[PDB]
Amino acid sequence: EASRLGPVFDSCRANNRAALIGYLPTGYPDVPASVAAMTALVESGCDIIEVGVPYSDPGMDGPTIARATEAALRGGVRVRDTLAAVEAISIAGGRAVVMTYWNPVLRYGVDAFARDLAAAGGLGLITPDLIPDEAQQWLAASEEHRLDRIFLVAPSSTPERLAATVEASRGFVYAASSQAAPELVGRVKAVSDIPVGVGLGVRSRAQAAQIAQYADGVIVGSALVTALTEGLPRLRALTGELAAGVRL
Template identity: 60%
Template sequence: MGLTEVFEKARAEGRAVSVGCMPAGFPTVDGSIAAMVAMAEAGIDAIEVELPYSDPVMDGPVIQRASEIALAGGVRTKDTLRAIEAVAGTGVPVVLMTYWNPIERYGVDAFARDLAAAGGTGLITPDLIPDEAHEWLAASDAHQLDRTFLVSPSSTDERLAMTVAHCRGFVYATAVMGVTGARDQTSVAAPALVSRVRAATDLPVGVGLGVRDGAQAAEVGSFADGVIVGSALVRCVLEAPDEAAGLASLRALSADLARGVRAVTR
C-alpha cells in the first residue's frame, strides 16, 4: 500500500496515521530492518527511514547518537536503499528522511531512480527548502516520488503557501521550534500550524518533533493526519541491553502509539 492510500484509509476511519522513524544501519543494517519490521508488525502505519549523516543539524542527541553508531558501523547510502527495499517489501509504506548532501553526492536523479526501484515513496528533506530544490523537483516528477518539505511555526503565510504547493504526499509540520527529541509536553504551536497548513492545502499534515508515547500520539492525532515519532522509538533500541530487549521495547511503544492514534476519532 502506498503512503497516500494509508492516509486515505486512516482518514476514512477517522483517525491519524502513525509514522515511526529509525536511522538505517542502526545498530546494524539488518538490525535496523528488524526494528522497522517490528514497528510495522506492532501497528505503526508507515515507516520513516533516516539516512545517517555526519552533520544532522535538525536532530537532537538521541538520533545523533544513533546516526553516529550507524556511520561508525560503516553504513553506506546503498545500505539505506537496501533497508528501504527490505522494509517496503513487507507491505508497509516507507519514506526516507535525509539531509541533502548525500543525495546530491549520489546524483539527484540517480538517487530518485534507485529510491523508486527500492519501493520508497519519497523524501522528507529537513535542510532542503523548495527554493533550492530545482533538481529534486524534476527528479521526483520523473520518478513519481513524493516530496515532503517542512513547515515551521516561524514560516510566514507566504512561505507556507509556497512550501506546501511544492509538497506531494504529505506536509511535515515541525511542532516545536527545535530539534528532534521526545518532550514531556507537545507544542501549543502545533494545532495552530496545522490549521494554517490546512488553509493552504488538502494534503495530509504530519506533525513531528516531541511525541514520546500513546497519550501524546492521541493528542497530536486529534488535530493532525499523521503523528511522527522518532527519538522515543530510537531510544528503545539505544538504551536496550541487547537486541531482543530492544525489539521488545520497540514493539511495546509501537503498539502504544498505534493505540494512541486510534483512541481519538475525528
C-alpha cells in the same frame, strides 16, 4: 494523478484515526539489526516508515537521534544500506519514505537516487535541509519517478513561504516544532487540503492521542530510537501503545 501516500491517509480517514509515522536510522545499532527493527515497526502497526540516512553533521536532529546516527557511521553504514532497508520494508508489506540531508543525495546524484529509491519501493523523500527554492533538480526527479516530496514547515514560517512550501509538497507536509503545533497545522489547513504530519517528541500513548485530534499523521522518532536501544521487545510494545493512541 494523486500522491503515493494519498491512499494511506484516506485509509486512515475512513477508520477515524491518524497515521503513525515511525522514524529509525539505518545501521543503528547495525545494518542487520536496524532492518530487523524497521520490519518490526510494520508488524507492530506503523503506517509509514521514515528511513533515516545517517549524516555526519545533522543540524536538525536532537541528541537521541544524533548519537544513534554517529554510532551507525562509526559502524560503517552506507547510503546503499538505506535503499536495502526500503526494499526490505516494501517486501514485508510496509510503506517507506527516506528522510535524508541533501548532500548525500547530491553525491549520489539527484536523478540517480530518485530512480534507485523508487525501484526499491520507496514512496517519497523528506528533505529537512532542502527548501523549495533549491529543489529544481529534486522537483524534476520527483515528477519523473513518481515520488512524493515532503517539505518541512515551521512556526516561524512567513505566510508567503508557507503557501510556497505547501504548494510544492506532495504526499504530506512535515510540521516540525504550547499551542505551536495545532496553530501551525491550522495555517496549513487554511491554504490546502494536503495531509499534515506532526513531529513533537512523542513518548506516550496519551501524547500521540492529543496530536491525532488535529494532525493527519503523528511522527515518532527519538522515542523509537530510545526503545530500540533498551531492546527490540521494548520497541514492539511501545509501537503498540503508539498504534492505539492514534485511533482516539
